[PDB]
């Protein structure tokens with residue numbers, strides 16, 4: 001027992017991080033087979049960042065302008081191309097540490113682990129969700145661009161995020177590995193802001209089940225509620241609506257604990273209306289929303305990866 | 307900016323986890339050079355666990371009773387010995403992935419990352435502190451014994467914890483890598499309990515500085531307090547005393563923010579007496595105490611590891 005915000009083991013990804021320097025810009029790149037992926041604003045400078053026409057900026061580059069430095073070994077670049085907001089630098093060497101991988105584009109509310117990197121060297125690993133407003137609340141300092149987020153699923157790394165920028169509110173914005181941004185953000189230093197966020201309802205309910213599996217039973221009740229009447233109370237507290245697809249998803253957890261999904265919604269209703277009144281759930285005084293139903297099952301039954 | 311409970315990258319340790327089976331017991335082992343370390347209660351059975359005389363249990367073993375299975379390769383054991391509560395199995399092969407490492411025994415209140423493992427395969431990674439009562443609040447299911455906790459410091463892995471047991475209250479107890487338990491626990495299924503815990507005062511103060519670096523300034527004030535008068539209020543809320551050594555430690559953070567340590571104590575005083583009153587600090591509605599002064603500086607300035 002116990003319940004912790006758990007990241008995936010980072011080893012398979014650490015073997016892919018490299019440093020990419022062009023001009024006066026250093027950031028991280030992701031080296032898979034003979035290609036290095038990185039944010040395209042590495043070809044910028046400080047006066048570029050206002051309003052670049054990245055196509056203009058890149059027709060003006062040569063291969064030798066890109067220092068790709070893989071620890072203590074320099075990787076010769078032999079070609080370059082742009083896909084949306086990422087660069088793909090073709091190098092003369094294939095990474096022998098290339099794991100089995102996929103590029104996936106995740107839905108808001110799904111979670112992933114982030115390996116924060118600087119100068120191609122990993123700094124730490126932590127778990128994040130994609131917020132409903134397509135930001136993530138990460139931990140990123142200057143030079144972290146190029147760090148990726150990922151999930152592992154047996155032996156395969158599904159890469160789902162590359163870091164590009166911080167917004168004025170201190171949240172973070174980036175792309176999938178094909179360089180399409182999550183949300184309406186652009187890789188420009190102009191006025192942008194995150195949009196109103198909401199709480200991820202289905203995740204809260206999964207986290208409440210985690211709590212019950214782990215022996216927190218103070219917030220339960222017999223009241224029940226209809227899905228309709230639950231969503232009327234959720235919209236008042238800035239929670240996303242609950243769909244039957246969310247309900248079905250919560251089936252295995254409902255079954256394991258013996259608490260009907262709609263009964264757990266009746267619990268959440270009274271927690272939103274009364275607060276917690278000094279109590280805590282899983283060592284948290286807030287309703288936690290960055291655990292998926294999958295995350296709970298995975299952790300509460302011990303799934304591993306090879 | 308941003309502030310997350312960050313684990314160290316797990317790669318160097320993943321390359322050391324192996325599976326150890328003796329009799330009807332499977333757990334994890336740590337393979338460094340030609341030695342595999344694991345909890346000694348692997349030589350037990352179910353009726354053993356009441357009150358074993360592990361010396362009796364081990365004089366009765368042969369090398370071939372220990373299946374040490376390193377992924378898809380079996381490691382022949384060629385010798386075995388017991389040091390305190392861990393076994394050291396000598397194997398005919400040295401792990402080529404052995405990182406630079408040390409065994410360290412940490413003080414309560416220090417933090418470390420835990421790579422949870424099952425059947426020699428890593429499941430996830432997360433950050434923990436050693437509580438003042440020498441438990442840790444981890445996430446561990448049956449078969450996780452042998453997972454280690456560690457810190458990284460440039461290129462060197464300092465191993466500081468190996469998992470052995472869960473106590474009735476759902477917290478976790480284990481040893482350093484030389485097999486001496488943290489706290490008064492023994493590797494026996496008999497009546498044991500954790501002892502009263504306290505909150506790690508110096509860590510809370512570091513976490514408050516993290517908050518200020520990241521722009522949370524609602525809990526600040528001009529009141530100041532003496533160290534004496536602060537500790538009178540701390541003891542009433544079950545916090546550990548603050549020492550000048552704690553104060554000096556908090557020097558760099560005090561300097562970076564411009565807030566004297568004793569001023570930040572005056573802040574913490576009023577947060578203990580008034581609560582937070584709806585506000586949150588770093589997305590937490592509780593005072594967080596598993597970030598060390600070192601953890602804060604590391605994260606708020608981007609230190610990496612090679």
Ligand SMILES: *[C@H](O)[C@H](C[C@@H]1CCNC1=O)NC(=O)[C@@H]1[C@@H]2[C@H](CN1C(=O)COc1ccc(OC(F)(F)F)cc1)C2(C)C
Nearest residue numbers: 041140141142143144145164165166187188189190191192
């Ligand atoms: C790349 O390593 C770096 C990481 C960030 C630095 C600090 N924290 C980070 O996550 N990215 C980076 O610098 C991007 C680059 C330039 C601007 N940028 C930002 O993160 C800041 O962007 C930004 C957005 C909006 C905004 O509002 C203002 F007032 F209108 F202009 C200011 C700045 C790229 C090209 C986006």
Ligand SMILES: *[C@H](O)[C@H](C[C@@H]1CCNC1=O)NC(=O)[C@@H]1[C@@H]2[C@H](CN1C(=O)COc1ccc(OC(F)(F)F)cc1)C2(C)C
Nearest residue numbers: 347446447448449450451470471472493494495496497498
């Ligand atoms: C090893 O993988 C396993 C991990 C734990 C199983 C569930 N969560 C875990 O962390 N360890 C393990 O089973 C140890 C083994 C046997 C007992 N044990 C426990 O974790 C439970 O110990 C325990 C302590 C006190 C207690 O009180 C009671 F009522 F008095 F007896 C009950 C059980 C070793 C040899 C400690």
